[PDB]
Design a protein around this motif. Structure first.
Motif, short mmCIF file in Angstrom:
data_model
loop_
_atom_site.label_atom_id
_atom_site.label_comp_id
_atom_site.label_asym_id
_atom_site.label_seq_id
_atom_site.Cartn_x
_atom_site.Cartn_y
_atom_site.Cartn_z
N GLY A 37 -11.46 63.76 51.73
CA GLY A 37 -11.63 62.34 51.47
C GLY A 37 -12.98 61.84 51.95
O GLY A 37 -13.38 62.09 53.09
N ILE A 38 -13.68 61.12 51.07
CA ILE A 38 -15.00 60.58 51.36
C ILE A 38 -14.94 59.07 51.15
O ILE A 38 -14.43 58.62 50.13
N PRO A 39 -15.45 58.26 52.09
CA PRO A 39 -15.35 56.81 51.93
C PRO A 39 -16.26 56.30 50.81
O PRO A 39 -17.21 56.96 50.39
N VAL A 40 -15.97 55.09 50.35
CA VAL A 40 -16.57 54.54 49.13
C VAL A 40 -17.03 53.12 49.42
O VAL A 40 -16.25 52.30 49.92
N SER A 41 -18.29 52.83 49.11
CA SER A 41 -18.82 51.48 49.20
C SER A 41 -18.31 50.70 47.99
O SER A 41 -18.87 50.78 46.90
N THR A 42 -17.24 49.93 48.19
CA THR A 42 -16.58 49.27 47.08
C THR A 42 -17.35 48.07 46.53
O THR A 42 -16.95 47.53 45.50
N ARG A 43 -18.43 47.64 47.18
CA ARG A 43 -19.21 46.51 46.68
C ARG A 43 -20.52 46.91 46.02
O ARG A 43 -21.05 46.12 45.22
N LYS A 44 -21.06 48.10 46.31
CA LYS A 44 -22.26 48.58 45.61
C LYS A 44 -21.87 49.53 44.48
O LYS A 44 -22.32 49.36 43.33
N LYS A 45 -21.01 50.51 44.78
CA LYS A 45 -20.48 51.37 43.74
C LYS A 45 -19.31 50.67 43.07
O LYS A 45 -18.35 50.26 43.73
N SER A 46 -19.40 50.54 41.75
CA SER A 46 -18.35 49.92 40.95
C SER A 46 -17.39 51.00 40.47
O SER A 46 -17.81 52.00 39.88
N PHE A 47 -16.09 50.80 40.76
CA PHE A 47 -15.03 51.76 40.49
C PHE A 47 -15.10 52.32 39.08
O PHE A 47 -15.54 51.62 38.16
N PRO A 48 -14.66 53.56 38.85
CA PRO A 48 -14.77 54.15 37.52
C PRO A 48 -13.74 53.58 36.56
O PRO A 48 -12.61 53.26 36.95
N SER A 49 -14.13 53.48 35.29
CA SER A 49 -13.21 53.14 34.21
C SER A 49 -12.85 54.43 33.49
O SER A 49 -13.27 54.68 32.36
N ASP A 50 -12.06 55.27 34.16
CA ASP A 50 -11.58 56.51 33.57
C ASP A 50 -10.47 57.16 34.40
O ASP A 50 -9.81 56.50 35.20
N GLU A 51 -10.28 58.47 34.20
CA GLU A 51 -9.21 59.22 34.84
C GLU A 51 -9.51 59.57 36.29
O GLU A 51 -8.58 59.72 37.09
N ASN A 52 -10.79 59.69 36.66
CA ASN A 52 -11.16 60.04 38.02
C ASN A 52 -10.75 58.95 39.01
O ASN A 52 -10.98 59.09 40.22
N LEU A 53 -10.13 57.88 38.51
CA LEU A 53 -9.68 56.80 39.38
C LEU A 53 -8.53 57.25 40.29
O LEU A 53 -8.36 56.70 41.38
N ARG A 54 -7.75 58.24 39.86
CA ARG A 54 -6.68 58.75 40.71
C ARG A 54 -7.24 59.44 41.95
O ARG A 54 -6.61 59.40 43.02
N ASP A 55 -8.41 60.06 41.83
CA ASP A 55 -9.07 60.63 42.99
C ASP A 55 -9.45 59.57 44.02
O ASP A 55 -9.71 59.91 45.18
N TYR A 56 -9.48 58.30 43.62
CA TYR A 56 -9.69 57.19 44.54
C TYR A 56 -8.35 56.77 45.14
O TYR A 56 -7.32 56.80 44.46
N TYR A 57 -8.38 56.38 46.41
CA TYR A 57 -7.16 55.96 47.08
C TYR A 57 -7.52 55.12 48.30
O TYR A 57 -8.67 55.08 48.72
N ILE A 58 -6.51 54.45 48.84
CA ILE A 58 -6.64 53.65 50.05
C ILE A 58 -5.97 54.42 51.18
O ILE A 58 -4.78 54.75 51.10
#
Lengths: 217, 212, 212, 217
Positions: D35-56
């Motif tokens: 797991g690698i943290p994500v800058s949710t305000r500079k990087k804009s979340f993906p509009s695709d399938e790789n979104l499942r790799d994202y989590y809280i």
DNA sequence: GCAGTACTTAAAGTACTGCT
DNA sequence: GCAGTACTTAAAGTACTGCT
């Protein structure tokens, strides 16, 4: 800073520092009915009768961090373990606590209005209740009520005032020594009256005394 | 800790152990406020919050500290006129009684609490409110170290009367607030010292005679 | 918080949240010590106490901070000679493996704790003791914010090896201790960075080539 | 910073901030199993399938200041009061806790010696035990063991990892908003498995779960 | 420019003796 | 020159986003 609590030769004794005038253990001298603190290292104690007017005033506590291993609770438990405070002694205390239903904190603190004025300034009288009891051995037990500092409500603090004639060594006619602490043999009756003082001080203190006394019985 | 002094004083609000501490009225008593854990209310409860300043008159033997500094800096600007000083000096000459004269009394009472004699200690306090909402308090305490009394003057400034507004917000680090001192607050603070005790009065009279 | 740097460094001992914190060995693990509530022992337990410094190599892109400052100030004094630098530069050219190459592993295991699969995380650490008693540690951590690793160098200095003696005494306020850095400690600290990771090594080699 | 715990429409929901990457609630994205943290305000979340790799990833606690009015204990008590967690649900949990006798902290943390050396530097392997369980709803529950910071012994911390597809609104193809928190409807099975995780984490945690579950029954 | 976030010890603070 | 004593909140501290 803490006073050393010990058992020796059938007695509970505590060592009281006399060169810490800003601690909860301070040496006072009464001038016309009020207690005034005393610089025990610059002023050298009197070699005469006015020495009785000198005394050690100790703001004594019972609990610390929700535990009963502090000052009065350390003296009472040691007194219990060495048969200085008997079963009937503790039994009589709990029956006294069960009968006590009014407390010093029930008197409250009040600000009373006056018919008096000071050159345009309104004048009020803040009335604080205190409880005092003299014991035949010479000590005085005091209970004062003050406002809780960080919250609403009252907190009650117990004082014991120990005449210098009740401690050794005799400081008559000399100045206190560096880091000098003083040996005071605690009569059993004072410990019982100190527990009584906490019982009647407030309901919060009584539940602490009761829960502690029931645990050592 | 010190405060830096139209007379303007800058008051620290993140030091509750100081002579200057933020308080709020709860059940009618001043309670310390944790200005950095608790957001100040934005509603009408903000009037319950105030700054309590244990204000002094002199320091290091000379009269250039807090109140003595305000008064001299105000009198110089024409803010406090010659007649303003005469009135205070006249007022001081009219004053005989002081709060210390009342003293602290321990009145014996005829009640017993399970073998304990009950007494009552009576502490006198002088209180004055100003139209803008500030309060001036004078309290008496046993002279520590010596026999006698010691009188202290307090000024209580509502948080409404300082800038910036602390509503819906926790205080900042080493945060200091803007307070413009009204002219009558300066004069009432001096009269507070004049009536506190003869010692303070002669101290005030000596200073006012110095700048008149 | 910063430390001020025969090379001599002055270390604060009353800031347990810093990169420089006082610790003691209890049950084999470093435990933070409250240097102001607890008197340090005067007996043999004092050897169990040490200062843990998370020491850095560079700051603000230039090599004049902590270790890089010691090494340049030592090399200038003739304390570190040309051959001392060649040996470190030669040592760096000999180094292929770094602690980061080991990485952090999560090894699967065949055991279950009431429906929970059990794993083991394996963190690698490099450790070296010097004859005078100091320890040099290198620890690996997941690169925060990015994919990869981040390696950190620690030096652990026994309280016995600093002045003044803290025995039978609580630390003073903003208290700072005397520590004379042995020459081999400076060279072993550099070799620690050289073996931490290729990134640190090229960083050390760039600095040593600058002063040779 | 705390997550808002609420009840709505038959569900326990919690609001999770997604723009506080240094809090105990942080948005991560897995790259090759870590797991690698994500800058949710500079990087804009993906509009695709790789979104499942994202989590809280949420480091969830049960107790605070010796009280059970915090995070998981607030969710469980609300679940209890609204009949989301039934009597048999709590009864089954306590019978599971009574049968559990080995814990994650029993594995300990150990420093293992190696036959490896790094150019004169001794090499050790610090072995930390973790426990992981995937639930059918998509969430992951983690228990890691670390050293107690200020004292000797271990402390165990429970994590729950929530796929972004399990929360609303859909952040697909957009950047997080200022102070954006996110609504997550908590399945009852996850609350039971979270209580299970605390039960098996350590004996200290189990006694906290048991004393809390017995108090609401 | 500064806070948010995390967590715990050490510092701030008032005022005189008293200590080293 | 500094601590001892009392007691509690606010500050120190590390390091990047993120906030206002």
């Amino acid at each position: 800073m803490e006073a050393s609590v010990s058992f020796e030769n059938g007695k509970i004794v505590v060592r009281l520092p006399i060169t810490r005038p800003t601690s909860k253990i301070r040496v006072k001298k009464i001038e016309n009915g009020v207690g005034i603190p005393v610089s025990t290292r610059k002023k050298s104690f009197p070699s005469d009768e006015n020495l009785r007017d000198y005394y050690i005033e100790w703001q004594i506590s019972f609990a610390r961090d929700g535990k009963y291993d502090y000052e009065l609770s350390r003296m009472v438990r040691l007194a219990h373990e060495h048969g200085i405070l008997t079963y009937n002694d503790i039994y009589e205390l709990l029956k006294f606590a069960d009968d006590v239903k009014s407390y010093l904190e029930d008197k409250g603190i009040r600000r009373e209005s006056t018919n008096e004025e000071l050159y345009g300034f309104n004048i009020y009288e803040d009335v604080y209740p205190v409880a005092k009891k003299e014991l035949p051995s010479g000590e005085f037990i005091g209970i004062v009520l003050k406002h809780a500092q960080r919250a609403v409500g009252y907190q009650s603090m117990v004082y014991v005032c120990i005449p210098l004639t009740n401690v050794e060594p005799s400081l008559a006619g000399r100045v206190a020594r560096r880091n000098e602490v003083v040996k005071y043999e605690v009569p059993v009756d004072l410990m019982k009256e100190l527990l009584k003082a906490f019982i009647i001080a407030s309901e919060t203190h009584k539940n602490d005394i009761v829960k502690f006394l029931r645990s050592i019985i």
